[PDB]
Design a binder for this molecule. Structure first.
Ligand SMILES: O=P(O)(O)O[C@H]1[C@@H](OP(=O)(O)O)[C@@H](OP(=O)(O)O)[C@@H](OP(=O)(O)O)[C@@H](OP(=O)(O)O)[C@H]1OP(=O)(O)O
Lengths: 189, 329, 141, 216, 57, 54
RNA sequence: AGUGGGUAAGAGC
RNA sequence: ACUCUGGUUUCUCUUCAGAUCGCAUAAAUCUUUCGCCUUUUACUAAAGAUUUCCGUGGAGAGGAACAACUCUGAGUCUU
């Protein structure tokens, strides 16, 4: 037998039930709870290396979470096809240069952006329902960037395209000369 | 171009060349995978969640773990906020202030969790709609370039400054390329990849220290000038042990101190360069003591002629060390 | 080390502390095989007879006697504890930890001075004694 | 070639009785049963030696009670007491001790002795200054051969031909050499450009290092 | 020290040849990474542009 | 007793993860120790012969 | 840059 | 122009890693020189030795996928 993916609200309920010391429901379940707390630095590293790119809005990433809500690892290695990654970043370089040239008085986001005593916002009434904004994305030319426009700004551009990538593991990418030339022309910057 | 950007260029080149030169082939490994035995254990569950949700969850979990570590000895006067700033709740007494001292590892962990909190908070602010995607990218770049100013985690590990001086350099590498043409100097750049990867590469090496420190700290049971006094005492013990092993101690227990006194007397006689001959001492025992004295004398001479030459070179030495070395010389 | 008396269980340590009415009890908490513990053992054995009048020396292995490790913070490689009439005595050594001598001292004269100062201070009823020599700096030059 | 000039001039045949020793910290019954287990038993090994290494005995390390600070002197026969079945030599190898006792088989026509100096102790290398007292005129080596191999040999008398001496500490020393002139019988000591005639009487009054003997 | 001392500079040269490094035109069609193309076009010496216009028939 | 049975699981996890190069580096340490002891025997070894003669 | 090396001991309520 | 050829993906496990394991790059320990120097804990910067960590390739083993013919090639494959 194998364990399957739990519903997303399961971990949310587990974490919300682990509010503070006020609840007397859990007072002695400590050994197992603090046994995995030693692995906090890996949890720190996982989300920082899996943090979404500036052309993305929502990044549904796999998560390995403790059954008591102690810890949560982003169980994904950020694999990227390097020519596509560099071309995407060149597109962002162009876009940010144009935006900085255009928007005169650019607003500096203030740090820290939240009150010190303010608890973290729950992912049920602050971020989940609200429509995400538009990420930085270059206006791809429909004629020059014909092959890449379909999949340029996807999370993993061609993951299920069995022709170009071997499978879901996203390794050993095979490309064609037209799309590589398009990527190079985009990434000249 | 100004001097600062040039020095940034040479410093980046220096770090790159140091990385390349000190490269070593990866050691053969049996391929034991993390996050793969977790799902094997009946303690972890797999799912798929939005990244911002996971970041908020990890920030909350890290805050809870740090709060649990703070209230370790039931000392509830060190308030840790949700931005990972630790402060006393009141004017704590000097006894309490001494009693509420945490090592550099704890504060490094606190500041690194503060940095992750800043990153996830920037993502949350972008998701809410207060800041545009351009503003989110600029904020992330400013975070990854001004970690020292925003966090100050170098105060608990100064080698981390090596990262900071790099990141600032990367900024000087980028801005003067970013702000070259009609775009003037301003806070508009958002090319945060360089600082992000630099800090990740710091994390991949700083993880084992914090992991082992918290594993020892949160465990049920806690665990925790010797060059010259290394060979001598052990040598005596060894010799003593040998004798007591072949001495019929069940019949001759009373002679252990006698044997040790004989050893000390022989060592003193050699040190004073005076004849030494115990008449009633057995021949094998005399041979034992003679060999022990020879070994101790060789160690003594080598130690003297090592410490004297160390002192001549200008090395930092204690006062009793100098007196003992002068006596030996 | 092996010359000095050894205590095998915590009750023996309690009896040793209680049975001394007019001598300061100096207990070395550590492991006989530890080189720093070896330095403490050799210094103590060197001055175990000189200060016999107003002191006594006992050796306790914290592995076989962990009964104090939690309460006395017996986690340094070698610690020295001074007691007088069933009362632990603190020494303002200058290192910030007045409870114990957690480091190895090379000079036996310094340890004799420490023991004598402890005896003088604790005989007068005091619980903390100021060390004759400062130890906030190793004076290496 | 089996017999080159060096082989027929210096090489000789000698026999080693190597016996494995159990760990000395073992029970007596266990030691006896290990000895009976045929692993810690004596084994005979023949070999060819270009020279014989002479192990100087331990220094007194203490002043003589009567005449203080006397340089040790050992007869040549005590050093020659090696290479026979009566005397063993417990080699203290770092892994385990070996009970090796030697025995000469076939003496070479010319004999080379090397007195072991410059022995590295546990911390550095020191030079043993013990002097060996030997009869320069002749020595007898028939008594240091087994009864099986004494029938073949007829000339075991050896006379000293060359003597090497090291003067000074191992860090900086001088190698002097005395040589016996066959034509005149005189001993000449030469050190670098210096050449002097030395009486045979005080040949043994030096830290002998390498000795070359002729069987005649 | 957050910043870097000016004394750490290595590109100090008494030789004008190394002080003034001949910029590469990259055949008049290449562009150095980062800098906007328009600034480099209006900055390049256009020796190759002049040669092309002379050889443009 | 669902508390002490988690410590054993965590310890087994840590041992399994530390087993990546454990045998390799322990073999290397053993070889280095033998090489070091080649020229510098143990102190009791230097006295073994005299000990037996005792 | 930085943590410390800055605990007065005592009497019972 | 033919009969048999039998998939690829993915999850694991177990060993081996030679090769830029990695067209990338960390930290710690130890040992030498160091720079600060005043005690630990941070350190300065070069060399040397291991180690842990984020990763990687191959092999083998065990699953699922899931279908399935075929791909492909051994050849007689034919005008
Ligand atoms: O060299 P400094 O004078 O200390 O300041 C420079 C400079 O800022 P200023 O020259 O305007 O002070 C940078 O921007 P450029 O002017 O080179 O475009 C950059 O400033 P921003 O990141 O705010 O654009 C950054 O200043 P800071 O570190 O204060 O942000 C940097 O300082 P460093 O040399 O310390 O990196």
């Amino acid at each position: 037998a194998q364990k399957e993916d739990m519903p997303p609200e399961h971990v949310r309920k587990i974490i919300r039930d682990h509010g503070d010391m006020t609840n007397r429901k859990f007072r002695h379940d400590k050994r197992v709870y603090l046994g995995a707390l030693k692995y906090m630095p890996h949890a720190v590293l996982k989300l920082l290396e899996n943090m979404p790119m500036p052309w993305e809005q929502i990044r549904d990433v796999p998560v390995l979470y403790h059954i008591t809500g102690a810890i949560s690892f982003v169980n994904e290695i950020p694999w990227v096809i390097e020519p596509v990654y560099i071309s995407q970043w060149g597109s962002m370089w162009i876009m940010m240069r144009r935006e900085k040239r255009d928007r005169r008085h650019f607003k500096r986001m203030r740090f820290p952006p939240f009150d010190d005593e303010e608890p973290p916002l729950d992912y049920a009434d602050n971020i989940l329902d609200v429509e995400p904004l538009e990420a930085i994305q270059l206006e791809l030319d429909p004629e020059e960037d014909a092959p890449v426009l379909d999949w340029f700004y996807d999370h993993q551009p061609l993951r299920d395209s069995r022709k170009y990538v071997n499978g879901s593991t996203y390794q050993r990418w095979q490309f064609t000369l037209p799309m590589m030339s398009t990527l190079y022309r985009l990434a000249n910057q | 171009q100004p001097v600062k950007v040039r020095v940034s260029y040479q410093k980046l080149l220096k770090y790159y060349v140091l990385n390349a030169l000190k490269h070593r082939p990866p050691k053969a490994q049996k391929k034991r995978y993390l996050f793969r035995s977790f799902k094997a254990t009946k303690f972890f569950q797999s799912t798929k969640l939005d990244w911002v949700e996971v970041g908020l969850q990890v920030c909350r979990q890290g805050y809870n773990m740090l709060n649990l570590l703070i209230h370790r000895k039931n000392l509830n006067y060190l308030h840790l906020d949700y931005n990972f700033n630790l402060k006393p709740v009141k004017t704590l007494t000097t006894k309490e202030r001494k009693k509420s001292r945490f090592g550099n590892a704890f504060h490094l962990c606190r500041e690194v969790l503060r940095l992750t909190k800043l990153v996830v908070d920037s993502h949350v602010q972008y998701r809410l709609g207060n800041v545009d995607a351009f503003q989110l990218a600029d904020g992330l770049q400013y975070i990854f370039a001004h970690v020292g100013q925003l966090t100050g985690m170098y105060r608990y590990k100064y080698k981390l400054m090596r990262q900071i001086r790099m990141c600032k350099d990367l900024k000087h590498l980028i801005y003067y390329r970013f702000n070259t043409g009609p775009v003037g100097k301003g806070p508009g750049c958002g090319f945060w990849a360089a600082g992000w990867r630099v800090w990740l590469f710091f994390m991949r090496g700083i993880t084992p220290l914090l992991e082992r420190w918290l594993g020892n700290l949160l465990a049920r049971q806690f665990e925790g000038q010797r060059v010259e006094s290394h060979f001598d005492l052990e040598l005596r013990a060894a010799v003593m042990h040998d004798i007591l092993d072949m001495m019929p101690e069940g019949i001759k227990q009373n002679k252990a101190r006698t044997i040790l006194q004989h050893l000390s007397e022989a060592w003193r006689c050699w040190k004073a360069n005076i004849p030494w001959k115990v008449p009633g001492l057995p021949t094998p025992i005399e041979n034992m003591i003679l060999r022990y004295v020879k070994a101790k004398a060789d160690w003594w001479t080598n130690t003297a002629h090592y410490n004297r030459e160390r002192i001549r070179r200008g090395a930092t030495v204690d006062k009793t060390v100098c007196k003992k070395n002068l006596g030996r010389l | 080390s092996y010359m000095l008396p050894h205590l095998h269980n915590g009750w023996q340590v309690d009896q040793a502390i209680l049975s001394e009415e007019d001598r300061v009890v100096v207990i070395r908490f550590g492991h006989d095989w530890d080189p720093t513990c070896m330095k403490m053992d050799e210094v103590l054995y060197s001055i175990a007879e000189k200060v016999k009048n107003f002191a006594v020396i006992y050796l306790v292995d914290i592995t076989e006697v962990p009964d104090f490790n939690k309460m006395y913070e017996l986690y340094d490689p070698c610690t020295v504890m001074f007691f007088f009439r069933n009362k632990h005595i603190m020494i303002d050594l200058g290192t910030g930890n007045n409870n114990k001598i957690n480091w190895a001292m090379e000079d036996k004269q310094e340890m004799v001075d420490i023991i004598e100062t402890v005896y003088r201070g604790a005989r007068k009823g005091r619980g903390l004694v100021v060390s004759p020599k400062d130890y906030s700096t190793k004076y290496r030059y | 070639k089996k017999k080159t000039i060096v082989t027929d001039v210096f090489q000789g045949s000698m026999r080693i009785f190597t016996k494995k020793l159990p760990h000395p910290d073992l029970p007596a019954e266990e030691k006896e049963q290990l000895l009976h287990n045929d692993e810690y038993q004596e084994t005979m090994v023949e070999s060819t030696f270009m020279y014989l290494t002479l192990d100087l005995p331990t220094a007194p390390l203490y002043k003589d009670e009567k005449e203080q600070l006397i340089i040790p002197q050992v007869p040549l026969f005590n050093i020659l007491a090696k290479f026979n079945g009566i005397t063993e030599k417990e080699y203290k190898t770092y892994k385990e001790n070996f009970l090796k006792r030697f025995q000469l088989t076939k003496l070479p026509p010319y004999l080379i002795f090397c007195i072991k100096r410059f022995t590295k102790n546990n911390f550095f290398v020191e030079k043993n200054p013990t002097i060996v007292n030997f009869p320069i005129t002749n020595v007898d080596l028939r008594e240091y051969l087994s009864e099986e191999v004494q029938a073949v040999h007829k000339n075991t008398t050896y006379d000293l031909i060359a003597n090497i001496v090291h003067d000074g500490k191992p860090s900086e020393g001088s190698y002097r050499i005395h040589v016996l002139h066959h034509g005149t019988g005189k001993w000449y000591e030469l050190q670098d450009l210096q050449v002097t005639d030395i009486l045979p009487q005080m040949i043994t009054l030096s830290e002998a290092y390498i000795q070359i003997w002729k069987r005649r | 020290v957050f910043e870097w001392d000016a004394s750490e500079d290595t590109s100090i040269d008494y030789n004008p040849l190394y002080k003034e490094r001949h910029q590469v035109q990259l055949l008049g069609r290449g562009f150095i990474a980062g800098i906007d193309l328009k600034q480099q076009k209006r900055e390049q010496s256009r020796f190759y542009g002049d040669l092309m216009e002379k050889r443009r028939t | 007793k669902d508390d002490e049975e988690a410590d054993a699981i965590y310890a087994a996890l840590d041992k399994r993860m530390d087993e990546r190069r454990k045998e390799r580096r322990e073999q290397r340490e053993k070889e280095e120790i033998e090489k070091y002891r080649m020229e510098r025997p143990k102190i009791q070894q230097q006295f073994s012969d005299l000990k037996r003669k005792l």
